[PDB]
């Protein structure tokens, strides 16, 4: 019927896209040059041990101030650590259970969370009555909230289960702009520092980059053969790394529209469960399903160093919003500050 011509067009367009990408595929300078500053051995020591979590920590997310870090445990418990004094600024028990995402507001005035309860909870930390009162309970998703991020105190993006990242208006308690382009349920979501384009990783292994003001999938990067765990934009907003269930991390370029770099070694083979970029972006730190995490040069994919901390997988990563320190959330309930 109508399907035959459309799918034929799809095939030929995919071939054309591959041809265009390989046509503009040049020799990558970064790995070729070793006369550009090699990272060398980086011996690194943790300073804080934010013990005080009891369940496995799923997500951790630094605040805008790069002092207050919100972490969610497996049992439905948010801890807003004061990273300098290991002080629980707030401990929020959540109505839902099995939360895996903790979204800090872009003003440090809200925290959003999502779990298998398939509901995104927005809590106002700045309630003038002292206690952290609930703000909104957004419901209507097709599945669990793999990850969510604040664009505005009234605008959020909730990468829910079953291929949806609907942009929600917190003010109206109504979703605004559904994003439906995936075929596998969305598993990650990363905002560009531009805050106009969000890349969503799913179990279709295809990182779909979405324009946040129109509702259309801007680009579609691929190269991972496994479901995408976590995505972290470059400090430029024109490139981003991507980790998946494979030991491979692929740094894609928006302008090139194709994979810029790869990051994998034979010594360690484990799914990249977290990806981070330093303030410069020259360091790419990846948390592994293996208990330790490893930092590579984000330009030569050679060993910058290995953080031998923890005894369980580094379930989440987060760098300060000036890249002075990096917090490693883990599954053995000890967030470690590295600086």
């Amino acid at each position: 019927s109508e399907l035959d011509q459309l799918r034929q067009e799809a095939e030929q367009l995919k071939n054309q896209i591959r041809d265009a990408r390989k046509a503009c595929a040049d020799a990558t300078l970064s790995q070729i040059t070793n006369n550009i500053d090699p990272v060398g051995r980086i011996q690194m020591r943790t300073r804080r041990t934010l013990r005080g979590h009891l369940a496995k920590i799923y997500a951790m997310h630094w605040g805008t101030d790069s002092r207050l870090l919100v972490s969610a445990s497996q049992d439905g418990k948010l801890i807003i650590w004061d990273s300098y004094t290991t002080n629980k600024v707030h401990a929020i028990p959540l109505r839902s259970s099995w939360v895996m995402t903790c979204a800090y507001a872009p003003s440090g005035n809200y925290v959003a969370c999502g779990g298998l309860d398939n509901i995104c909870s927005i809590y106002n930390l700045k309630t003038r009555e002292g206690n952290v009162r609930v703000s909104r309970e957004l419901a209507g998703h097709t599945g669990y909230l793999s990850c969510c991020r604040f664009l505005d105190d009234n605008q959020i993006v909730t990468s829910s289960g079953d291929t949806t990242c609907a942009l929600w208006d917190i003010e109206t308690g109504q979703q605004t702009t559904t994003f439906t382009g995936h075929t596998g349920d969305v598993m990650s979501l990363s905002l560009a520092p531009d805050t106009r384009l969000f890349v969503s990783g799913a179990c279709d292994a295809s990182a779909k980059l979405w324009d946040v003001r129109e509702g259309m999938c801007r680009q579609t990067f691929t190269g991972h053969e496994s479901d995408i765990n976590a995505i972290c934009f470059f400090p430029n907003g024109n490139a981003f790394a991507t980790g998946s269930d494979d030991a491979t991390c692929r740094l894609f370029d928006l302008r090139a529209d194709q994979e810029l770099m790869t990051y994998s070694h034979d010594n360690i083979i484990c799914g990249i469960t977290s990806v981070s970029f330093s303030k410069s972006g020259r360091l790419l730190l990846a948390g592994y399903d293996d208990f330790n995490c490893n930092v590579w040069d984000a330009l030569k994919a050679d060993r910058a160093g290995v953080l031998a901390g923890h005894d369980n997988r580094v379930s989440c990563l987060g760098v300060t919003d000036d890249g002075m320190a990096v917090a490693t959330g883990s599954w053995d309930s000890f967030l470690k500050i590295w600086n």
Binding site: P93, W98, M100, L116, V132, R133, G143, D185
Partner: protein
């Protein structure tokens, strides 16, 4: 009146001045046969023409609301059991079903498990304790605080000093449990278990 656009019913001696169509709302009601002028009728106020019915004005009210605006709303002083009785007496089968459903939800709540409390274990050191108890989230109740012996520092001066069990009620039993299937959630749960 015997025949008129409006009807003057007499429930328990109290006059209800309503319209014919409110009674004629459905034809499976006792009131429909009451409204009709046919043989086998000798219970009426023959001084004004009002149909004198031996029924309570208490439970007739909520039922009459069902035929007046499509829904029955019980009073805070009238048992839903009484309105179920009245609906069954008037054979309003849809009303019987709806009142039965309301009674089913009410009895599921009241008999046992009106709510299903959820419980959380905050971990607080002594210094911050009061504040995070003071700033403890609205809608949650403190339930327990327990110290922990430690070889780091026994009793006081511990950064895992206190375990605070808090809780809150949950209305999911009167509304029914909710769950949807997803394989990725299940495999992630399996990962979390190990």
């Amino acid at each position: 009146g015997s025949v008129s656009k409006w009807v003057r019913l007499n429930v328990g001696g109290t006059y209800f001045l309503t319209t014919r169509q409110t009674l004629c709302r459905d034809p499976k009601s006792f009131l429909y046969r009451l409204c009709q002028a046919d043989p086998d009728l000798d219970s009426d106020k023959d001084e004004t023409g009002a149909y004198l019915i031996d029924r309570d004005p208490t439970y007739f009210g909520p039922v009459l609301n069902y035929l007046r605006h499509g829904k029955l709303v019980i009073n805070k002083d009238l048992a839903e059991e009484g309105v179920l009785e009245e609906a069954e007496f008037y054979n309003i089968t849809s009303l019987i079903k709806l009142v039965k459903d309301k009674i089913r939800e009410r009895d599921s709540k009241t008999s046992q498990v009106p709510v299903k409390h959820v419980y959380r274990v905050l971990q607080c050191q002594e210094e911050e304790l009061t504040q995070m108890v003071s700033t403890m989230s609205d809608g949650w109740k403190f339930e327990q605080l327990v110290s922990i012996g430690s070889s780091y520092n026994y009793g006081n001066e511990d950064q895992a000093e206190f375990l605070c069990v808090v809780s809150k009620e949950l209305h999911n039993t009167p509304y029914g449990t909710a769950s949807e299937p997803s394989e990725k959630a299940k495999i992630l749960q399996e990962r979390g278990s190990r």
